[PDB]
Amino acid sequence: AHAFWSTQPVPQTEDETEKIVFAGPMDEPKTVADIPEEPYPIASTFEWWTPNMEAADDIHAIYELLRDNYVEDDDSMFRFNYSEEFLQWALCPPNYIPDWHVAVRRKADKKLLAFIAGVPVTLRMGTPKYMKVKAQEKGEGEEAAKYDEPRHICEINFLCVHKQLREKRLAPILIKEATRRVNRTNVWQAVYTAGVLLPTPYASGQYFHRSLNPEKLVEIRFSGIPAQYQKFQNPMAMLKRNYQLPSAPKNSGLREMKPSDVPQVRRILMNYLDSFDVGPVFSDAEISHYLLPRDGVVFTYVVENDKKVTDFFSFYRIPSTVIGNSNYNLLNAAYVHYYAATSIPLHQLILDLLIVAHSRGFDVCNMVEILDNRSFVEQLKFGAGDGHLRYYFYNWAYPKIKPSQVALVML
Numbered sequence: 394a395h396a397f398w399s400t401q402p403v404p405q406t407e408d409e410t411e412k413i414v415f416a417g418p419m420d421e422p423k424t425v426a427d428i429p430e431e432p433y434p435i436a437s438t439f440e441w442w443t444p445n446m447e448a449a450d451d452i453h454a455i456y457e458l459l460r461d462n463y464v465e466d467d468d469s470m471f472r473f474n475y476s477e478e479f480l481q482w483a484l485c486p487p488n489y490i491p492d493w494h495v496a497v498r499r500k501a502d503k504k505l506l507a508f509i510a511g512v513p514v515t516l517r518m519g520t521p522k523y524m525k526v527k528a529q530e531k532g533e534g535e536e537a538a539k540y541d542e543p544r545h546i547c548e549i550n551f552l553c554v555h556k557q558l559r560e561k562r563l564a565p566i567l568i569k570e571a572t573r574r575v576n577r578t579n580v581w582q583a584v585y586t587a588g589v590l591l592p593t594p595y596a597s598g599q600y601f602h603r604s605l606n607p608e609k610l611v612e613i614r615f616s617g618i619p620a621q622y623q624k625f626q627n628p629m630a631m632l633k634r635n636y637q638l639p640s641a642p643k644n645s646g647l648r649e650m651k652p653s654d655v656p657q658v659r660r661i662l663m664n665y666l667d668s669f670d671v672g673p674v675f676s677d678a679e680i681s682h683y684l685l686p687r688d689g690v691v692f693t694y695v696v697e698n699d700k701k702v703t704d705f706f707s708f709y710r711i712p713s714t715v716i717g718n719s720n721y722n723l724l725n726a727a728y729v730h731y732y733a734a735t736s737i738p739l740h741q742l743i744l745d746l747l748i749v750a751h752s753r754g755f756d757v758c759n760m761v762e763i764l765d766n767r768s769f770v771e772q773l774k775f776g777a778g779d780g781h782l783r784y785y786f787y788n789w790a791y792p793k794i795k796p797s798q799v800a801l802v803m804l
């Protein structure tokens with residue numbers, strides 16, 4: 394059933410995943426010296442290419458590949474159109490490794506055919522709370538705690554094969570080469586997400602959506618008008634009214650995050666993320682990188698009253714190409730990123746996210762039910778979508794956890 398994934402150090406079934414008590418590696422210990430120095434073999438008509446994702450023109454070449462060939466829905470109505478500025482942000486965080494950005498080109502004429510990208514993350518990925526209690530009940534604490542320390546691992550994203558090269562087994566070769574390049578830097582685990590079900594997720598969450606421009610969402614068929622609204626004289630007017638928002642934020646002291654906020658936003662975020670079983674650890678440099686405002690890419694606001702920052706939220710932008718329509722070419726989506734509330738309820742903080750995103754011309758706000766995102770779904774009028782996001786590890790046994798015990802946002 395999985396000619397590639399059955400060869401890899403990942404749990405092969407749910408049954409297997411059910412026997413997993415403790416976090417730890419799946420493969421035997423190996424060293425950098427054990428890993429092939431030479432690139433993985435590839436057909437003589439292709440070549441490996443390492444783009445420089447801080448050079449405008451190489452970011453542009455990867456941007457076109459993804460614009461034309463990255464994830465689309467099954468009805469081929471929407472395809473992600475991550476921007477060039479977003480891709481430099483996402484793939485060049487502090488201490489990134491250029492060699493973990495891996496592309497395939499056709500040698501003759503240099504057509505770009507495939508891509509995959511790794512970036513560093515420091516991740517808490519030790520045994521989860523409910524399995525540390527089982528370990529205590531059995532006298533097994535020391536082996537449950539072995540990998541408690543945050544680990545410096547690889548986060549994988551942006552795997553893409555050009556549509557003309559699909560179903561030719563190119564994705565496994567690009568995954569093997571990325572694994573080799575990561576293992577040559579003495580890193581042996583990765584985390585990744587996907588919509589598709591592969592062997593074998595450690596957590597899965599549904600997507601949720603909050604309409605901000607319901608008339609446009611209906612016009613492009615992201616949304617339909619729900620059947621009850623047909624009982625009204627003007628179903629669309631009622632739908633618009635349902636989802637209307639204030640025109641300015643309600644929290645006193647909301648303002649954009651500045652460099653001087655980085656230590657306090659790091660402290661409140663890290664204290665909050667500590668509470669989840671799987672989550673990132675960020676340095677001040679990574680808080681700066683991932684959360685300071687960047688035009689068209691990431692939007693972050695703090696609540697400061699009387700000189701103290703007590704709360705913050707962030708969202709990022711991923712537009713999609715609207716493939717069929719005549720009135721619109723683009724879907725402008727805001728995604729809930731990290732946040733922390735210490736002075737107000739989470740729903741009150743996230744209402745201001747929706748207000749600012751709507752003011753800035755976003756059409757929808759999306760999120761997965763990770764973090765404490767379930768706590769504001771109903772009041773803020775999010776609905777579940779049909780998608781999901783599955784969380785995976787490479788070379789790491791891990792017990793199944795609920796998505797409300799995951800604190801890693803994947804872009």
Ligand SMILES: CCCCCCCCCCCCCC(=O)SCCNC(=O)CCNC(=O)[C@H](O)C(C)(C)COP(=O)(O)OP(=O)(O)OC[C@H]1O[C@@H](n2cnc3c(N)ncnc32)[C@H](O)[C@@H]1OP(=O)(O)O
Nearest residue numbers: 395396397398551552553554559560561562563564581787
């Ligand atoms: C220590 C360091 C480790 C670093 C590496 C960690 C692992 C990272 C793993 C990557 C994490 C990526 C995270 C993201 O970016 S998720 C986003 C993935 N990208 C897209 O969906 C874009 C649109 N689609 C495509 O570009 C292609 O359809 C792709 C490239 C996805 C597959 O190309 P193609 O359709 O031409 O197929 P093939 O003939 O080459 O290959 C077929 C094999 O590929 C397995 N497959 C299909 N889809 C995925 C998928 N999303 N993750 C992992 N494996 C996938 C499939 O089960 C089969 O294996 P098996 O069933 O036969 O066994």
Ligand SMILES: CN1CCC(N(C)c2nc(N(C)CCC#N)c3sccc3n2)CC1
Nearest residue numbers: 464465466467471472473615713726778779
């Ligand atoms: C009515 N629904 C069907 C379409 C779903 N939706 C908008 C959606 N959008 C997608 N794209 C690319 C636009 C995402 C946004 N916003 C994709 S990609 C794979 C599945 C998928 N589904 C949302 C629920």
Ligand SMILES: CN1CCC(N(C)c2nc(N(C)CCC#N)c3sccc3n2)CC1
Nearest residue numbers: 464550586587588589600759780781803804
């Ligand atoms: C690694 N990536 C994490 C985020 C994913 N993403 C932005 C995303 N994915 C979605 N899905 C269902 C997972 C797609 C993949 N892979 C959807 S559904 C509707 C909005 C939406 N946005 C795209 C893949």
Ligand SMILES: [Mg+2]
Nearest residue numbers: 560561562563
């Ligand atoms: Mg292929």
